[PDB]
Symmetry: D2
Subunit: 461 residues, 4 copies
């Protein structure tokens, strides 16, 4: 008689369980942490507030934390990212979860609340698991006293890490944090190879468009932009790349991409005259990957080739000026998370109008909105890092430290390279890869232990 | 012409070398941009730079840039097979002391470094060092330690040379401060990776003219050089397998689409023939070592390799392959310069029609420089623009003239600031015709950077 | 008004299907160009076409193009899993008889074909046939031979159907002429290859959401479908091995950078379990059959496959995989529609946490159409423009109206002329924005072609 | 004291022999035929005039032919394609060969002449092996009385095949021929994969230019154009493709290339106004692959980006209007087969002029001119077909038949598919590939013999 959740359809739990069982065979690092740590129960008594995409992969993460002794109460960090059978399976296991695919903003900011409050009172939470920093923000500003019992926050993504480092610089961060993103088994796995898998996947599911031979413009060439560009280029697209970082632009050139700017001479003065109309008039598909604001602006959207696809794979929907398109253009729903944006006006539309754009997931995270996000074997690395980060902070009860000792521990640091390598070895084992052991002679030559770490912290891989 | 302070293979190659020098200048905008940017300031006036790095056309553009800013130099190559004789001829014909030629013996190599160190039998008044691998750096610390009292810094190019400096620094035996030129993003993630992608299959084609598509390759190491080497072979259609001791690099090889294997059963190298995965090695048509380690392609692996397999090394030193074992036990038949068939049938001669042989390239030396020309000019543009920036910073620092307390604080191993790394990258992108977008002021505050950059924290790995 | 001559899953999906048809029209310029050129002339006025091909959004544009040119049609799908229900709904809502839904039983599949053949309990007065796979063609010859007396021709879509036509032709059992639509270059070297490149990994991801990069795949066959399938997996970062019986196709797989292996030791399929390369198959994460042959992934191969490997088929018929053996001996657990875990522990029941299972996609049926949506519109544009041209040509020839003596001289299986193949390609290129260069008169005279084409002899293989 | 030859340096013979022994290990199909037919000696009494690039690969072909009883007198079919160590080894073997790298046009015709005449009188030749049709043309126009003794011609390449068909169409072909080019183990192997290997190889040896990130234009997308485009794209170049054939242009699009024309709207009206100056101003490398005439014309050369590389990989140099460049621009030789073309004027040049183009091999076949052509393991397929074709035509004895019997056999034909398959099988085994054998039921199911042929003659692979 468990009555403490809200999902789309609880009858999907059996289907979710079947896909969870499959996902466990695809996540050896996360499941290896189950077998290695099951005995000592390091999260015994941990009460975790969790806000991250309620997918099948997150379901395995949740059950791993619970299997090690923790209690959790969960919601998604995006309105379109939940897999309804995953949320159903989690609720059926007696775990508080408040998520469904296709939430509104009111239902979104309410689901996060249902995790925060238990019977109208603050849950005795002592850990925070976040993806994007939204949950972290709500606690700091609306319930600032709850954080005096919390031993730390483990943040998943680049946007959340940057926002935390704002507070570390400004002195408003109330607990230490783990930069889970900057583990190599995360940033160079999740952010790059994950988007390589799921970008073209989501574009195919949404539109079924042939990609080979067509022109694409990728905004950004960081970790997500590198994977996004590869996802399209391996499909045969002609991919152009935009960047504000010259180093990332250099890699794009060396990787075989033409580097262009949406603006003449790269200067964005806000006018239509700044737009390279000849370039934008050739683009069949534009993808924003920046984590920045307004990188696909209104003037770009006016200049795009007719029937071009527009989508965002960055964390927030403000990469594209969707607000401009709501106010001025008529939206025609093709199917859930697929809209035709008619540039002829907003007072209705001609069903056979040829001057439209196709927007995916209403500008939200396209891989999770129009598909299922990253596959299990990639998220295995990110969530194994997530569990170890929860272990590191909970075993080092910062909230129980005296005030004088707190200052040395207050930081937003990564995990030690040893843990990063241990996650990597389990991932390599999943592929059947065989890592070579250094001889004692070889380890001395290059100056490392046979047991690692094998690189200085300055190494970039 | 009256000037005899050099030794090259053939001075008459200068005109040919000069013609290729002019072409390479058009391919190196960042280096040429520094030449024009600082010429009116002569930032290297008074600098007397000892240089030890492959005497290619690309190095000549670096050298003539250094001279253009006011420096005097005396140069040698850091490998016996890597010198382009027409590049050395043009440098010597320009009045620049250079001692390098293709096909040096071991003794001539050691002799060439000293001819730069000594002028007219006595030590030259050097004050700067440019080194690639640390051989010249080590020779100064060991055999000419008094010269280091007047030298203001070392700019080290490659990973192996950097490793030696960090050891001396930890030992307290390093005498002058150094700049890690290797770990600039416009060097390590450009030279080491993309350079080997261009030049690895380039060197293999020149040495053997072998079809690479459809054949099996084993790449030991998946660092920057291992990544680029594996891509150089995979893009030609090779079936590439990767070996690694670093599980993080091994994870990247899997995700990049390679099967990760070990030459030893379960990865355990206990020194026995029984430890060799004879089934795996018996399938390999080509083996490339990229680690910067010793004996990663060992004697038992050579015995187990498929007949007529190609063996080469692209790490700095030739000890990655047990070539001493092959010189001792098997007969060498030269096909052509830097290409030898190594007959595994015995020591005393060979059947001219023998089928059981291996092909070793560049006698184990750097195969891209030994059998081809190394990295193209446009890639070395980033690495050598960092060299000029590194030389300027340390020369304008005057370490040898600082107080003792100041000496101790700056006897470090540093890189270049990220701002200069970005400025180098910006010029290379413009060389491709790329256009970098400028942030708006509202966007720059949103992501917490300057509109002018730097755009990433120092922790960023790219 | 009162239209009931159809059977679909859900008529309320019609508005959704109409929206996707309007999108697909913008993606199929060759087919829509044919619709606009010929609509006013009504070249298919009086044509009555029995159609049997995957009731997809793409087929819907084909259907409405034939109708726009004046034909009447009665349609069914040629596979039980390939129908898109919103496409079938939109066609039925347009007043076109269509009998197709996703998830038909074998009984319902036969019934749907019959409902096209029969109108109100008696044979429809059909005079044209459009087929994909030859099922409708076989039923007409075996069960309704009198209907063929009034039929002017068959236009066959795929390789398997063309093989069945040639067997009937040489046995003297083919009653009407046919056009081999498959062997247009804008069909074979477009649909069969690039179409499977797009949709193979698409279907695997939708069915399993498995990571593909770094895993091992075995592709049986290296024809057009096998070439496109191997690329679909290799571009995702899979380690792809290829099996073939044709040495020429095997040679291409090698030159394309794949290792060519056989499921059987030395390639000898002696029917015993001992002939299976257990070590090879114990490493395979994914096996794809692309042959159009029978039992190319047999029971002994399925017993030897690595645990949790995915098994799927993209050839036309499901007998490429011995699924009957798996039905007879192993327990099936449905994950979701067209995704089954097959537990090799026994027939009667299974452990929910059993680790020894295989994942079968689409029950061995066409995986791209079964677990995804088949080829994209812009690719199917080439194939279906050929279909319209073939229907027009055979209908205008009026074979059925000829005397018996004339029918014998006209009875053949033919391909479309190269000139039409080229005009289809030109519209496809314009759809991408490509600009074809025009020969000068001297250039055309130099290579011996007309300025307007055709540009290649009929022997050219492209 | 046999001196019936003409080479550059006979002392290079030992080097050529060392590389010939290696090359023989790379050519199992060619060596396999040499071992198979040695006993019968099918070419005993054959007297072959041979005209094809004197490479190491050609050396293995020549030595095979002589092993079966044939006598040959050899020449190269290009002035720049000879490997001097291969010609030296052949001459050192007592075989008449007249070839060296860097012949003049007058020397080229002299080398053909030296094979045709023996002691100032026509040789009693009865077989012809040709590459490009140069020897075939000289026989018909200058030595017709000798063709009455010739049994057949085996032609290597597309250009020579095209010339054969026009002679047959005009009734001027005097002897039958076998089109070796259109075997699948030659056309879809030599012409495509060979250029994939040797195009970027030649550009690297000629200029040592970085290719990644730069813009390329490939003229043509036939077999050679397909391999050339991949040769550049696999190096990281941004490749655009030009074609007159829309079907080949369709393949370029689907293969992931942007299809463009040097002329506005693809219309070549002969004026400078028709040149797409914007496109050609951004091209760093142009490669002609057509076998047509003047596909990189003077107006295109005027509009090319400064310092762009120009090279041809078709059979003849007239694909580029090199004659215009000789008349109007000053040529500065960088090194053999590498010339700078200064567009500042004809009379002299500034050594530091920036307005130049880099021409490789003076417009001749760039892979053979600046490198070594196709690798040994690729030429194994082409030359195995040549040996089979020589055996078949010599055993037919066309020159002995009466006129009415001649008329029935005077044609240009290809080798049977069964022999095409047997050559491919040996190539596959060279890679260690294992071909699966059909079961009798499978063979019956698809209607082929267990032995093959496995495809109908209409199949395009
Ligand atoms: N959808 C997913 O699966 C997923 C996964 C991880 C991260 N993300 C999100 O994606 C975003 C990017 O993450 P990342 O790890 O790649 O970050 P990153 O900092 O490594 O890369 C972002 C890049 O965008 C560039 N950029 C910024 N503004 C630009 C502009 N106006 N024009 C061009 N380039 C511009 C920056 O120079 C930078 O190189 C973040 O918001 C992150 O949270 C999404
Ligand atoms: N030839 C060239 O053009 C060129 C250019 C740059 C650098 N290099 C040289 O190449 C070497 C590698 O440089 P890098 O930048 O790639 O260094 P790196 O440290 O980034 O990579 C070396 C890798 O080798 C791996 N490794 C070490 N021992 C191993 C073993 N026994 N088996 C398998 N893997 C092993 C390490 O884990 C490491 O990841 C250095 O010596 C450098 O000087 C050559
Ligand atoms: N699903 C789709 O979208 C789609 C599209 C086109 C064709 N098809 C179907 O796919 C099949 C193949 O079509 P295709 O055009 O590629 O035909 P194809 O003749 O060009 O290719 C089949 C290949 O399989 C090889 N083969 C046969 N038996 C084999 C065996 N036992 N082991 C290994 N290889 C073997 C043959 O040598 C041949 O090369 C046909 O049934 C066709 O109808 C499907
Ligand atoms: N260098 C080598 O190694 C090598 C090898 C084989 C063949 N070849 C030669 O290369 C040439 C091409 O051979 P192939 O087998 O590729 O022939 P092909 O017939 O298959 O291809 C030639 C292509 O050029 C296109 N074309 C013609 N005129 C054009 C124009 N003005 N603009 C653009 N495209 C145009 C045609 O449409 C055709 O697709 C022949 O002369 C052949 O002898 C060279
Ligand atoms: N060609 C080259 N010249 C100089 N330094 C190099 N390092 C690698 N390749 C080089
Ligand atoms: N190596 C080679 N030998 C002869 N002809 C060729 N054509 C292309 N490459 C060749
Ligand atoms: K997923
Ligand atoms: K170079
Ligand atoms: K589709
Ligand atoms: K060669």
């Amino acid at each position: 008689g468990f009555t403490d959740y809200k999902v789309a359809d609880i009858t999907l739990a059996a289907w979710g369980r079947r896909e969870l069982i499959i996902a466990e065979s695809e996540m050896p690092a996360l499941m290896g942490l189950r077998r290695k740590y099951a005995g000592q129960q390091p999260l015994k008594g941990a009460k975790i507030l969790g806000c991250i995409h309620m997918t099948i992969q997150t379901g395995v993460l949740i059950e791993t934390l619970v299997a090690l002794g923790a209690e959790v109460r969960w919601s998604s960090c995006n309105i379109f990212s939940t897999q309804d059978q995953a949320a159903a399976a989690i609720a059926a296991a007696g775990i508080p979860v408040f998520a469904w695919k296709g939430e509104t903003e009111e239902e979104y900011e309410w689901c996060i609340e249902q995790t925060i409050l238990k019977d109208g009172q603050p849950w005795d939470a002592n850990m925070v698991l976040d993806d994007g920093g939204d949950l972290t923000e709500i606690l700091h500003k609306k319930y600032p006293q709850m954080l005096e019992r919390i031993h730390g926050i483990t943040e998943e993504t680049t946007t959340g890490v940057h926002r935390l480092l704002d507070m570390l610089k400004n002195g408003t961060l109330k607990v230490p944090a783990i930069n889970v993103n900057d583990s190599v088994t995360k940033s160079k796995n999740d952010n790059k190879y994950g988007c390589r898998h799921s970008l073209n996947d989501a574009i195919k599911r949404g539109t079924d468009h042939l990609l080979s031979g067509k022109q694409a413009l990728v905004i950004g060439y960081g970790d997500v932009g590198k994977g996004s560009s590869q996802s399209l280029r391996q499909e045969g697209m002609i991919v152009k790349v935009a960047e504000v970082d010259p180093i990332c632009a250099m890699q794009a050139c060396m990787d075989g991409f033409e580097v262009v700017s949406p603006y003449k001479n790269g200067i964005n003065d806000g006018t239509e005259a700044s737009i390279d109309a000849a370039l934008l008039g050739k683009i069949d598909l534009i993808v924003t990957t920046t984590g920045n604001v307004n990188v696909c602006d209104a003037n770009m959207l006016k200049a795009l080739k007719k029937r071009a696809v527009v989508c965002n794979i960055g964390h927030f929907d403000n990469e594209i000026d969707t607000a401009f398109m709501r106010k001025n253009w008529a939206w025609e729903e093709v199917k859930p998370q697929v809209h035709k944006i008619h540039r002829t006006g907003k007072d209705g539309f001609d069903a056979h109008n040829d001057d439209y754009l196709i927007l995916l997931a209403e500008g939200r995270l396209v891989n999770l909105g129009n598909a299922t996000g990253h596959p299990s074997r990639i998220m295995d690395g990110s969530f194994a890092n997530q569990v170890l980060a929860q272990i590191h902070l909970f075993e080092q009860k910062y909230a129980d430290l005296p005030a004088a000792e707190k200052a040395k521990r207050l930081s937003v640091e990564v995990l030690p390279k040893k843990l990063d390598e241990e996650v990597a070895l389990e991932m390599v084992k999943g592929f059947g890869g065989v890592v070579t052991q250094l001889t004692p002679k070889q380890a001395e030559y290059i100056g490392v232990s046979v047991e690692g770490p094998f690189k200085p912290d300055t190494y970039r891989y």
